[PDB]
Design a protein around this nucleic acid. Structure first.
Ligand SMILES: [K+]
Ligand SMILES: [Mg+2]
Ligand SMILES: [Mg+2]
Ligand SMILES: [Mg+2]
Ligand SMILES: [Mg+2]
Ligand SMILES: [Mg+2]
Ligand SMILES: [Mg+2]
Ligand SMILES: [Mg+2]
Ligand SMILES: [Mg+2]
Ligand SMILES: [Mg+2]
Ligand SMILES: [Mg+2]
Ligand SMILES: [Mg+2]
Ligand SMILES: [Mg+2]
Ligand SMILES: [Mg+2]
Ligand SMILES: [Mg+2]
Ligand SMILES: [Mg+2]
Ligand SMILES: [Mg+2]
Ligand SMILES: [Mg+2]
Ligand SMILES: [Mg+2]
Ligand SMILES: [Mg+2]
Lengths: 222, 53, 155, 185, 51, 148
RNA sequence: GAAAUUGUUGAAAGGGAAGGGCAUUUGAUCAGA
RNA sequence: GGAAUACUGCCAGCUGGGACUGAGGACUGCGACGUAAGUCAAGGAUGCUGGCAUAAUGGUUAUAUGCCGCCCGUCUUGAAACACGGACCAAGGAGUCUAACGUCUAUGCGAGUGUUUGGGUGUAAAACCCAUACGCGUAAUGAAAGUGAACGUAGGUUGGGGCCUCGCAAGAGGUGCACAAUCGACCGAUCCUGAUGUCUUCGGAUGGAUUUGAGUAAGAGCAUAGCUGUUGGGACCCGAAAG
RNA sequence: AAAUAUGUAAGAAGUCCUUGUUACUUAAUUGAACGUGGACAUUUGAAUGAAGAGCUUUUAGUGGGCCAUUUUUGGUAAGC
């Protein structure tokens, strides 16, 4: 005849069970990451010791940031930017690398800087600027309950489950990445490192594939 | 593809549980080990200019 | 009717504030403010006076003394952000500052404060007198000279 | 700056209240707003939406239409709901006994229903009888039967009733309407 | 009412990610790598230093 | 009501909603139906096919009363019977004492056969009848009596 | 008994216009608790 | 041979200084610490202290200073223009009303609708009441003579909101108004076919068709009012040379 | 004989199996079209996105354009 304690205690117990599940899942993720990284290092060393060359696997994930404003964009690049959800300068999204998406990045190269995001970069992006689409409602990812309520049907129970599904391009990468609202980054805090942004990174500019330096750029933009 | 998909679905629901019936775009290449046995790398350099006319 | 009074009136009931999660944790004062340190007063009527630092008080003020006999600055509170902590230390083992607290300074000259001044000054001057020209140092007022650069100066 | 993929500040384009100032209609809208919010009943939501509709979007539903709907297999005992006016129809000679909830009844429609032995109730009585719309049957009149509709989309080879005041010979029937005078349409 | 950033606000960092306590306790951001001593082949070194 | 018109809302806007380039001039395209064959041909041909030319034969001194002949379909055929008597006529569908309906007195000249009627004999007095109207009236056990 | 325009008094500014925007100094003036 | 260091990258490593902000207003949530009680930096500022208590802050105003600021209106691809109007001020000054209409909306009634030509009546241009008509609608089609809308549960198929049954649910099945597509049926016109019969030239049954209609297929209209649009009117206002 | 640009398709209105209608078609239940009945929902058959999709009515203004890169015509050329 109370219907308060026999609910709050059960909810606290359910929260503790969920937290223990998240804890063990995050520990497993950390083990996975460390093992994969040390296996890449060891494979490179072993190939060198055997007189071979370890050709690392091509990158499956890119982070793309729109570095160009919204004026004077030709229609095909403009449509590709809208389909990659880069509708504003300094907006960023994760793109699973395939032929079909590489030919989009090719079209939008002069308007974006993109590259291969590290785990640290992805984790900091999701922690600080992570927002989800729920009635699309741009909801901040302040609690794991929101992530479970919207992506739990894909087995994603926490913000670290989401980060994992991003970094390792999982079976539900499309749903997790679309649930992620496009990241609204600031201008870089130490500048762009170049006097002019709108030539290719190779030519001393800012746009195009900057493959591993996207992590430094995004960290200074985050 | 329709006929192969029907055949694959039938053989799948007869053999086990796996479908994978959607086409996929060309995926990024997997890691590989490249040997130098009989394939020691040859060093190229840019050639000087000439007219050959 | 000159204004046709509104259909609805707001409630004249002041709402309670929601619970504030701001506890009062103790101040962490910089490591240079150790009791016995000679301080330079930056503001107030005794600006430029060099004084001796004493017990750290509960209102976060520093209890300082001239000593009053040395430069005329009595026992008084001071704000830590308005002093420069020099690297000149006297020993305050022997001075009883347990008596002086916030209530001690709550708002002609009280004989009680005169006698506490005498006791503290007598405990401090004895320690001062074994450092040559430390009494003269404390009697002299600090000032910036032409070319003094406080970002380069050490105290 | 944002490259907007859609019109900004676009209104939904649907009525959220009746344009009518009928206080009783507004009371019905209040009741069905409460019901649609706190019942999870698709019936309540669609009735709330229907209560907003303009007159040409609430074409009258005749007792003939009600009788055919009740002749539907299994509908004979369902309460017919018409968010609008129920009109009489003398072209039918055997009306069944039924319950009809409607915004308005014509004198003849009410008389026919009651003489057949049923009841004409209002939508709030319907809400009390079936708060979730249990055993209801929502009927809608023939919208695309208005005289104005037959002129919509007028053009060559459309067959869509020119807008005309006087009809007959000498009135828009000679050149462009027959092959003997220039061409046909 | 207010977005509090993890990567600061340790409280929020712990509300999310219960594994952060274990990470910090075991110092997994400063993990020591097991030592190995594989040496590159002479062909690798000769190719690398080839002009 | 003038206070609800858009000309109150155009006060302060120079062109009154009529444009700066193409102003509100007097009669830019001609008055009335001017140019229906020359510069309004598209608007005539679309939305008014058949407007120009002659389509039939004339009739000098036509009197519409010569053609007065209101049509009543069989689907009503009973609204002409008083409501009270209609129930007791529907009951007792006798070949004797069948209700007599004066359609001319009701104001109709021809009875058409659109709907269907109950199987009760009715004596229909009309000036003209459709073939199927008479067939249905006879199938219901009634008869059509021609009047003038 | 308005304005244009004008006299007097008072105040203020003024090196080839004046007027205006943001901000503040100065002078004058003033409401609110 | 053993190190170091640089460079790059990682840390849910520690920590100092500076700036802007303090939205919200009982509780509710997720957490953290704690053995537990409770505590907390955990769904947004509190604690302590001082001076002033009024022109001090602030507002207004004039001026000064820094930077900026071309004359509005108009036609125009383009106006500060060496394009036009404007010396100044007051008052006046330009989309109106009407006949007939399109769409949309509100209202009344609804297969009907419209009392107000007129009559009755009146507290007298009001309000109130009313017969017969008439208008529009309820039938279309054809030049016309003329003919004139159910094979059928007013059809079949597909989709269809809602409802109904089963199910914890997911879903499955049934019924499916509006509405959409399509194939049919019915009425009129056109072209054919041409039964019984007969004023032997009338009648036109029945069956058809790459034909046609602003049609039928359980009616939606009528009236009043409003914005907007249309046409005639001086017709948004002012303006010819002319006749 | 490119590059760029461009048509179509990437499914449930689908695929497979059986057999009913016809005055069409075949030498012929031959076929054509439309059906009845039966089987197949995790990826219902690429990617990405989708302040949703579809539909209707009715009206304003406009119907002098000019400029930049690139393609390009006349012209010696032009702020042509
Ligand atoms: K015009
Ligand atoms: Mg800087
Ligand atoms: Mg630059
Ligand atoms: Mg917010
Ligand atoms: Mg404007
Ligand atoms: Mg003008
Ligand atoms: Mg006077
Ligand atoms: Mg004056
Ligand atoms: Mg370093
Ligand atoms: Mg001030
Ligand atoms: Mg300037
Ligand atoms: Mg010009
Ligand atoms: Mg101008
Ligand atoms: Mg000039
Ligand atoms: Mg001029
Ligand atoms: Mg002038
Ligand atoms: Mg005036
Ligand atoms: Mg004139
Ligand atoms: Mg003349
Ligand atoms: Mg023009």
């Amino acid at each position: 005849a109370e219907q308060v304690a026999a609910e709050r205690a059960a909810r606290k117990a359910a929260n503790k069970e969920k937290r223990a599940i998240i804890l063990e899942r995050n520990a497993a993720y950390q083990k996975e990451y460390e093992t994969a990284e040390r296996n890449i290092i060891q494979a490179k060393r072993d190939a060198k010791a055997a007189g071979s060359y370890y050709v690392e696997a091509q990158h499956k994930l890119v982070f793309v940031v729109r570095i160009k404003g919204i004026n004077k964009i030709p229609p095909k690049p403009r449509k590709v930017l809208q389909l990659l959800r880069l509708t504003r300068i300094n907006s960023g999204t994760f793109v699973k690398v395939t032929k079909a998406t590489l030919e989009l990045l090719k079209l939008i190269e002069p308007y974006v800087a993109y590259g291969y995001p590290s785990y640290s970069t992805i984790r900091q992006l999701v922690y600080k600027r992570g927002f989800g689409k729920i009635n699309k409602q741009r909801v901040p990812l302040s609690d794991n309950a929101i992530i479970e309520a919207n992506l739990g049907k894909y087995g994603i129970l926490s913000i670290d489950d989401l980060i994992h599904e991003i970094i390792t391009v999982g079976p539900h990468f499309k749903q997790a990445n679309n649930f992620l609202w496009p990241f609204k980054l600031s201008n870089p805090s130490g500048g762009w490192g170049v006097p002019r942004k709108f030539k290719h990174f190779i030519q001393g500019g800012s746009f195009g594939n900057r493959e591993e330096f996207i992590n430094k750029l995004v960290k200074s933009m985050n | 593809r329709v006929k192969a998909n029907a055949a694959k679905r039938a053989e799948a629901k007869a053999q086990g549980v796996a479908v994978q019936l959607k086409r996929q775009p060309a995926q990024p290449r997997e890691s590989r080990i490249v040997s130098t046995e009989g394939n020691v790398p040859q060093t190229l350099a840019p050639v000087p200019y000439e007219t050959f006319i | 009717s000159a204004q046709k009074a509104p259909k609805w009136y707001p409630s004249e009931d002041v709402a309670a504030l929601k619970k504030t999660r701001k506890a009062a944790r103790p101040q962490k004062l910089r490591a240079s403010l150790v009791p016995g340190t000679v301080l330079i007063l930056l503001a107030g009527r005794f600006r430029g006076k060099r004084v001796v630092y004493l017990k750290h008080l509960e209102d976060n003020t520093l209890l300082i003394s001239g000593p009053f006999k040395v430069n005329g600055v009595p026992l008084r509170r001071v704000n830590a952000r308005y002093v420069i902590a020099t690297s000149t230390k006297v020993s305050v083992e022997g001075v009883n500052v347990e008596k002086f607290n916030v209530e001690y300074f709550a708002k002609e000259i009280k004989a009680e404060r005169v006698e506490d001044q005498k006791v503290v000054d007598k405990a401090l001057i004895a320690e001062i007198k074994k450092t040559p020209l430390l009494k003269q140092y404390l009697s002299a007022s600090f000032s910036l000279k032409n070319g003094d650069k406080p970002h380069m100066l050490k105290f | 700056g944002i490259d907007h993929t859609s019109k900004q500040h676009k209104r939904s384009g649907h009525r959220t209240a009746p344009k009518s100032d009928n206080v009783y209609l507004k009371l019905l809208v209040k009741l069905y707003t409460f019901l649609a919010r706190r019942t999870d009943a698709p019936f309540n939501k669609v009735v709330l939406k229907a209560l907003f509709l303009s007159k040409i979007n609430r074409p009258p539903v005749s007792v003939s239409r009600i009788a055919r709907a009740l002749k539907q297999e299994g509908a004979a005992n369902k309460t017919v709901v018409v968010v609008g006016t129920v009109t009489d129809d003398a072209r039918i000679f055997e009306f069944p006994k039924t319950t009809v909830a409607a915004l308005r009844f014509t004198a003849g429609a009410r008389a026919k229903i009651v003489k057949a032995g049923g009841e004409c109730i209002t939508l709030d009585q319907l809400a009390v009888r079936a708060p979730k719309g249990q055993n209801t049957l929502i009927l809608r009149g023939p919208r695309n039967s208005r005289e104005a509709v037959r002129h919509f989309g007028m053009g060559p080879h459309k067959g869509k009733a020119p807008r005309i005041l006087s009809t007959g010979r000498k009135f828009e029937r000679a050149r462009g309407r027959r092959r003997s005078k220039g061409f046909k349409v | 009412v207010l977005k509090k950033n993890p990567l600061k606000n340790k409280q929020v960092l712990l509300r999310l990610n219960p594994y952060a306590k274990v990470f910090a306790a075991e110092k997994l951001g400063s993990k020591k790598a097991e030592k190995t001593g594989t040496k590159p082949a002479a062909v690798f070194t000769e190719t690398l230093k080839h002009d | 009501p003038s206070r609800f018109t858009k000309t109150r809302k155009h006060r302060g806007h120079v062109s009154a909603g009529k444009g700066r380039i193409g102003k509100h001039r007097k009669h830019p395209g001609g008055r009335g139906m001017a140019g229906g064959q020359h510069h309004h041909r598209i608007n005539m041909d679309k939305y008014h096919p058949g407007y120009f030319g002659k389509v039939g034969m004339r009739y000098f001194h036509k009197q519409q009363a010569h053609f007065w002949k209101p049509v009543l379909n069989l689907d009503k055929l009973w609204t002409l019977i008083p409501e009270d008597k209609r129930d007791q006529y529907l009951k007792s569908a006798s070949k004797e004492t069948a209700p007599v309906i004066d359609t001319l007195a009701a104001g109709y000249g021809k009875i058409l056969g659109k709907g269907r009627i109950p199987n009760v004999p009715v004596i229909v007095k009309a000036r003209f009848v459709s073939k199927l109207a008479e067939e249905k009236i006879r199938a219901a056990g009634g008869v059509v009596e021609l009047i003038a």
